Amino acid sequence: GWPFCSDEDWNTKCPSGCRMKGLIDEVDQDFTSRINKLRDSLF
């Protein structure tokens, strides 16, 4: 039950690296899947 962050906490306090790797991978999967759908359509 940590205190809620303030905008001033950013850069002094940062997210977990495991969380960031999860989000990075999710974005990569979304983009690769969307690129493949566009490729399938165009050619």
Binding site: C14, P15, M20, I24, V27, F31, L38, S41, L42
Partner: protein, 47 residues
């Protein structure tokens, strides 16, 4: 690589330096917003 000249807080007893996960999150946000825009644009033309 961190050096006395390019890194004012450098203390080598603490090992090699890396971006923070806030730097990572900010890069990811900029990259995701940018690429998603380009994609949506193509998806609107083709779909």
């Amino acid at each position: 690589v961190a050096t006395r000249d390019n890194c004012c807080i450098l203390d080598e007893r603490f090992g090699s330096y890396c971006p923070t996960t806030c730097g990572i999150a900010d890069f990811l946000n900029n990259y995701q917003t940018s690429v998603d825009k380009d994609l949506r644009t193509l998806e609107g033309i083709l779909y």
